[PDB]
Write a protein that binds this DNA or RNA. Sequence first.
RNA 1: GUUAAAACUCUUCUCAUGCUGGAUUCGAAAUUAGGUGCGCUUCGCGUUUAAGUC
Length: 210
Amino acid sequence: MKEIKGILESITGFSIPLDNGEYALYPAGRHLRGAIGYIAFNLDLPISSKFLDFDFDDIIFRDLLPISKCGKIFYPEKNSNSLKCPSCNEIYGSSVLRNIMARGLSYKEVIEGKKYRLSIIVKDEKYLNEMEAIIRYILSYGIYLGNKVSKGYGKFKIKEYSIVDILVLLLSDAIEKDIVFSKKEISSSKFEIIRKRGKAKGDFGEIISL
RNA sequence: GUUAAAACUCUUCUCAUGCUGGAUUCGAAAUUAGGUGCGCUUCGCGUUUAAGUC
């Protein structure tokens, strides 16, 4: 199940609403899966159909946790959204969230130029082959995660990526917190905000050991 | 195949008001309207009257 680990760089700042006034310091892998499925359907590819069901564990999309300055990745706090990396502290917190208003449009947004980790593990090898093609599309062109994406909010650019085979605390929340998503298909324009109750972090279902 | 898309941080408002390139310094220092040229040329103070007289 060789994987691909890369460094996402925010050329433009992002914003992602977690509802009830909540916002995220880092983008979730659900957005990476959504954008990758959109450009796979733009490529008119087989992987698009694999993405089209919104239920395909063939490739596991991990969350785009921020790569720390000296630490590897910021680890979640118990019963909190604060992110702390092991090497030093670098508490991402709510500092990157800044309130903004746009001709009456009030909302919040994240500082660009902070690094983000990426890891997509493709079990099937043919899935890996289409993964390296759509990952070359992520490498040369850009990846877009968040809301007001078409305005440009959420531009992401790969710097350092290696296709490395991948060899407990839940790094990402696993389906009680409500990680809400939607399958907004191009043909099936039905928008389904599914509020999956699940265990939060600090304790794309994935876990990270010590 | 992102709680997504769907929304231009937009409209109004002149770097403007005061302050003179002004002050000081003479176009004068040197040079003679000088050099050449005869107021010359033509025209006789002539004409008239006895030193008479007793």
